[PDB]
Amino acid sequence: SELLVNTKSGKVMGTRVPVLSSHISAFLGIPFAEPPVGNMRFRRPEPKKPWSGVWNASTYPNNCQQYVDEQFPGFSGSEMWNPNREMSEDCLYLNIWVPSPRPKSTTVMVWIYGGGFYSGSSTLDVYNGKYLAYTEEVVLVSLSYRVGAFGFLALHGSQEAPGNVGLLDQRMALQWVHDNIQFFGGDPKTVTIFGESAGGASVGMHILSPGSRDLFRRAILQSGSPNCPWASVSVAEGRRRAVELGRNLNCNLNSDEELIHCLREKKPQELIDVEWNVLPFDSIFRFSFVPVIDGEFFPTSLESMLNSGNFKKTQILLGVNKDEGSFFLLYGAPGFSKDSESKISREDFMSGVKLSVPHANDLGLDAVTLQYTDWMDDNNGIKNRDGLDDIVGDHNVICPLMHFVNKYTKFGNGTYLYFFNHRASNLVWPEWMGVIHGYEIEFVFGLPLVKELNYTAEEEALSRRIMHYWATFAKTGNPNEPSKWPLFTTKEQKFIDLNTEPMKVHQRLRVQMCVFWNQFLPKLLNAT
Amino acid sequence: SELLVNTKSGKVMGTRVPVLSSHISAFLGIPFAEPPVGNMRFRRPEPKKPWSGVWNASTYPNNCQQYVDEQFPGFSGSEMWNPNREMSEDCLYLNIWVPSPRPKSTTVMVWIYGGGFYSGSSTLDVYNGKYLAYTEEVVLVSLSYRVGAFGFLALHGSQEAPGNVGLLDQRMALQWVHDNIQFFGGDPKTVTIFGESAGGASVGMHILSPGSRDLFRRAILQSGSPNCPWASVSVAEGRRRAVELGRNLNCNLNSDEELIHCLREKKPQELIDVEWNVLPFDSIFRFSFVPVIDGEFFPTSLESMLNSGNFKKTQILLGVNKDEGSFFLLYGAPGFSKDSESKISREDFMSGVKLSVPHANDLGLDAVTLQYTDWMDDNNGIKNRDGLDDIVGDHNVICPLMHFVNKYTKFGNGTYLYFFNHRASNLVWPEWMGVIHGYEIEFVFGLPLVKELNYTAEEEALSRRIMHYWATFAKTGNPNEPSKWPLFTTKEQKFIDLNTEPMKVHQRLRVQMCVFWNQFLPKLLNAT
């Protein structure tokens, strides 16, 4: 039977699913770790004990426990990102879409979801792997990992809540794929991990971390990179936030044992309810529990690892969207609203930059403001809104990714860079948000090929070339079929725009602004 | 006799001079102070003792002792600025051009020459007052004042070399004009002082200084303002440079008396020969002996005076040229040459900015470099040259003038701002220097009306409107004849370009760069 696969952990029974008037097989909710519940909450994941009998893999698993977005009740724009399954701490499962008939040894792609390390689900309709699997003949895998305090509460030195366990969940799933994907027809020697935002930062983290390198062949990072300012914290900041979380739950704070014990008795929603109270600053685009530079998963600082070539050398494909910051301003900066054009006054612009660069002294704040203000037209509301949008996107996504790419390329074996700037014709979000953070995902997963979703024919064509660029890169380490996407090089720094117009090649993606964020501002904050 | 004028200091006999196929009267070399020689060197000027008999005023006076430019021996571009008379410490004279027949009580314009406070002459062909006097029917006066150490050696507290004596020379000439111009047909109640570069900074200094305010009605400042970074020094820096000058001449340095006595015995050229050795930094656009913030001529800091409205309230007309910095780079920055296009490498650009902002720490230097570098094309030689040209002009002339104008306008009675950007068709300087510092003077003095000088007909027309704008402003406090040059206002900040094309009105002259130089950079250097 095509739907029965025998793995090293036990037999699994899949289900047949329709896709673009055909069918492929799906193995949903395969467990890859023991349930991290009870006294195992905050601990490193344990591998799933083999089971006898047949694991029913016909339906999606629970999603991990997480904050749920209620900003726009019922609005599809925001709810398409919320958990669409019941939540549970028992959430460590993976899903596999396999072409029919079963491949013998084909290219594998493993998706790692984003969500700021505090949210995310592998079961979202925009992450349905059937279109990509089917269209490109690849075995598509989506894993899951603990988020929020459950995945990243860090009390360095403690073995009970060491931190990074969410990253270790991802690693365990990659280990399982390495060990078992052959039985699904996948080639374990040709696995590409790919992910967006925190998922893209996670991808870069596995490229860096010695303990993860051997489990995959190449990588794709969308709108995220490991060195992003919101993607990690020191063990000291992690410790301080863990303690502050305990202080919010009236925990005994005398010892780590006392703290962890108290946190383990709290129901999931008690932790989620106060999670946001531990941030050190009034900020935007910052999340409470994220990866920690612990000296283990990350042997040293991320910058010294990037500088020294201490990372996996292979090919990478990565890029960003045009208006990465609009989401974060809508949700937390004064003057931005879902239903207005959100023209920003000069005072809101300034309160916007303070929120955007929480770690900056006043000189630094002045440097940012001057860098993004058109002084011939400082009261232009559209300009202030857009300027703020760029500050958020440049600081949080684009410039960190550009710093990663330039450092990586010195030691890597091949880099392909894109700038995604097509705004979907059917976007329900307002016009002022532009080509929003996360809205290239639907094209990567091929939603434009399903007529009912209402995209345009040219949008379907774009989705098809992105899928084929992604799958061909996974297969060969080059997105081009043997009009060309050129390699990004240290010298030339070439990249392509990704949209419905004839490909166009450019160079030095946002250099001007990124020399500011990657070279001048940090030098400025360190001297003052 | 039209050429004989009886003044309070004695009778003076002028000479008749031809001008544009007509004639006017000229009284050249009228003394207004006792010769500041011997033990009077470095001292405040003393008024000229009246003489009996007739002072022969038919020929130009000596020019003050000064450094002489020998960079391009025989080149007219540079020698047109050098003394064209024998030099002498006995140089305190003024020249007057009077319409014929003699006016009864007409508008007076008094020119104050520039030259970085270390050079300058009232007798230069480009300063010939006959064209303006004749064409606009004004009594035109050019004064002289001590420059270099002779005019600005400052040992605060000493009454022998108090500093600012060169400014006091200018004041004495303004006093003489106040007291005697009526006899030449000039109206002492309608005198406009006007000057370029250091002469324009001097004009602003008389507007500020309580002791000078009452001696004139209005003012015109060309490419210079009182708050320029090269126009003044603290009494401490003045003292240190005075002492260092003495140290260069092997002077006894035990007391001010010892120092001054030694400096007074040195021949003029001995002081001029080591003058440049006292600068505190390796720099460009910085001069050794300049005005000192002494608590007397300037009661307090220039900024607090500007901020508090502690200055003469009247109308002012002022502006800058497009490429103010080219001269200074040609003369002292690596990579610039008179006979090449001077395309600048990235390394020379950087050594250029260090020379341009001598007082800056490394963070400050980085801020300047980032502000003026196009990171999409950082090796563009033309761009590097031009970028450097703007850094020098913006920092030294334009932004300080824009700061002065915005502060002045809050309390003044009328401001008219221009941006002069026509490059003379007959310029002998290379093309890369653009609309060079000082080359609007020839249009203000009407050289384009003399056919042999080879300007174009449209250039003659431009000179005529500038002369009439300047003279009408002097007469009325408004350059317009009752297409309009609008008033500059705090709100609108309007200005006009001055060239051969139809007038065009703009706003916020170099705002972007000037917020950098007037607000951000100083805040940055003060915190670091």
Ligand SMILES: *[C@@H]1O[C@H](CO)[C@@H](O)[C@H](O)[C@H]1NC(C)=O
């Ligand atoms: C597999 O599980 C689903 C979910 O409840 C169920 O509906 C389906 O009938 C099951 N099939 C088998 C063979 O157990």
Ligand SMILES: *[C@@H]1O[C@H](CO)[C@@H](O)[C@H](O)[C@H]1NC(C)=O
């Ligand atoms: C990648 O590595 C291979 C094998 O070592 C080498 O031949 C090739 O030049 C490299 N490609 C790039 C783009 O560095």
Ligand SMILES: *[C@@H]1O[C@H](CO)[C@@H](O)[C@H](O)[C@H]1NC(C)=O
């Ligand atoms: C005035 O002085 C000039 C300069 O030497 C001389 O040539 C001229 O003849 C003099 N005229 C009188 C009347 O002294």
Ligand SMILES: *[C@@H]1O[C@H](CO)[C@@H](O)[C@H](O)[C@H]1NC(C)=O
């Ligand atoms: C200048 O002052 C006069 C007289 O006090 C006043 O009427 C006029 O409004 C002022 N003009 C400007 C431009 O301030």
